[PDB]
Amino acid sequence: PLKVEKFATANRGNGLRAVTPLRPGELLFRSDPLAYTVCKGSRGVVCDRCLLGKEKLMRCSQCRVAKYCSAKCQKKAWPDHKRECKCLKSCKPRYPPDSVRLLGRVVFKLMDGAPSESEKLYSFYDLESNINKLTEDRKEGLRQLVMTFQHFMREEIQDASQLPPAFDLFEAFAKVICNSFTICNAEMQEVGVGLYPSISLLNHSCDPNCSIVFNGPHLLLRAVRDIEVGEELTICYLDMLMTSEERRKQLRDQYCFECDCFRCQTQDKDADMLTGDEQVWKEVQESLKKIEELKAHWKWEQVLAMCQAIISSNSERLPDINIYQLKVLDCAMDACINLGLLEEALFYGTRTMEPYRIFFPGSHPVRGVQVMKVGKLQLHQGMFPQAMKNLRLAFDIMRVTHGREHSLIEDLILLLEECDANI
Numbered sequence: 001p002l003k004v005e006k007f008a009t010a011n012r013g014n015g016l017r018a019v020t021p022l023r024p025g026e027l028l029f030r031s032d033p034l035a036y037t038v039c040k041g042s043r044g045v046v047c048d049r050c051l052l053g054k055e056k057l058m059r060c061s062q063c064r065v066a067k068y069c070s071a072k073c074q075k076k077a078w079p080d081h082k083r084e085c086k087c088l089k090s091c092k093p094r095y096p097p098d099s100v101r102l103l104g105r106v107v108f109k110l111m112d113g114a115p116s117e118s119e120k121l122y123s124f125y126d127l128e129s130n131i132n133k134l135t136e137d138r139k140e141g142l143r144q145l146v147m148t149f150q151h152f153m154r155e156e157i158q159d160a161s162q163l164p165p166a167f168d169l170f171e172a173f174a175k176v177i178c179n180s181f182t183i184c185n186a187e188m189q190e191v192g193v194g195l196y197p198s199i200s201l202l203n204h205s206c207d208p209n210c211s212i213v214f215n216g217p218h219l220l221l222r223a224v225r226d227i228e229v230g231e232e233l234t235i236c237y238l239d240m241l242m243t244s245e246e247r248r249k250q251l252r253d254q255y256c257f258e259c260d261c262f263r264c265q266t267q268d269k270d271a272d273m274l275t276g277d278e279q280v281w282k283e284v285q286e287s288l289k290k291i292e293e294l295k296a297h298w299k300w301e302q303v304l305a306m307c308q309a310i311i312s313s314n315s316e317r318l319p320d321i322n323i324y325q326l327k328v329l330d331c332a333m334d335a336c337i338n339l340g341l342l343e344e345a346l347f348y349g350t351r352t353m354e355p356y357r358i359f360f361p362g363s364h365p366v367r368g369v370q371v372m373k374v375g376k377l378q379l380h381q382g383m384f385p386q387a388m389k390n391l392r393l394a395f396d397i398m399r400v401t402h403g404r405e406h407s408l409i410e411d412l413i414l415l416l417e418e419c420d421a422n423i
């Protein structure tokens, strides 16, 4: 029996609420995507199917765009790839926007696959589109995505008879905008995008009572606070390292609503997030656009070189509590780890630990994984009591946010065992 249920909220459309009391860590829903694809920067870096990175990937011989970690993944992916394959080939070397490839897989799944378990509570047809709130600028952008879709799908979709009944391409892209999920690997690197329509019932909170984590394309929804019967379930749609002004803009631009929560009313944590000299963090925030772009393409050496230029600058520096400085530190930590610079990684990672405690309150999967990385670096360095403390803290968080059903809990348990045997 389900612990959650769809309901009509008073002023946020449809939502999800608890049917039984919930405790921190309790698994509320599991889902595979209705449809998903690899994101632009991870294309050819991770496997199209399982979203794991490898040093060498096999490509699909027909289109040479889809790439896989194994013969098993390539064969298993063939049904959901067969029709897009003709489209990607005939449109080479033009590669579609991620949302267009995603919507292609939506159409093929809806036309050719059995009804999807991902739609059990809520279907793609049910999804909010926010049409009557879109600006003229947004509508124009969606009209270009429509034509991009029609161009890219020409080989497989000729007319409305190859679409689901009463299927409006404009309205479908509007649904995509405000219901796409960014998929991340175990290390919290962005690797894909997917639609999970039952999960799309969850409304936003800047201080949520639930959390989702991804294990490959599989999505786990867990409570991270006590929740009582009838209480609405919420997740945070946004990066925690954002000011209320930055949250207002993205929630307006992407989700067409204004947030009334306590954090937004009081600009909760804004002042701490923006400490240091404004001119300096303006420039660091500018640079982060290139840094994050490079990182989205796994270009670790260039990421590290840009981050070192900031972290160890000869010009003025920022406190580690500044969110842009914090972001640079994490990018440098993750680069060093992938480049095997483990002493330097531990240096940056340890510096993020107190800012992460402040900005990821309660149980948040992002902080749980960060602490696990630091303790793993400390274990490899022989700092056994210090590693053991952070590994236990990571377990305390990730037992709630990840849970037994997430394979990273297994990896963490082994690290805990290895570190305890040392002690």
Ligand SMILES: C[S@@+](CC[C@H](N)C(=O)[O-])C[C@H]1O[C@@H](n2cnc3c(N)ncnc32)[C@H](O)[C@@H]1O
Pocket: 011, 012, 013, 014, 015, 126, 127, 128, 130, 178, 179, 199, 200, 201, 202, 203, 204, 205, 254, 255, 256, 257, 258, 259
């Ligand atoms: C993923 S859907 C959530 C389910 C949605 N309420 C529905 O009816 O299908 C995202 C949309 O829900 C609405 N929404 C989500 N969180 C909200 C909030 N905190 N306040 C008002 N509306 C919200 C916005 O319309 C947003 O674009």
Ligand SMILES: [Zn+2]
Pocket: 047, 048, 049, 050, 051, 052, 068, 069, 070, 073
């Ligand atoms: Zn694979």
Ligand SMILES: [Zn+2]
Pocket: 060, 061, 062, 063, 064, 065, 066, 081, 085, 086
């Ligand atoms: Zn192919």
Ligand SMILES: [Zn+2]
Pocket: 205, 206, 259, 260, 261, 262, 263, 264
């Ligand atoms: Zn808010």
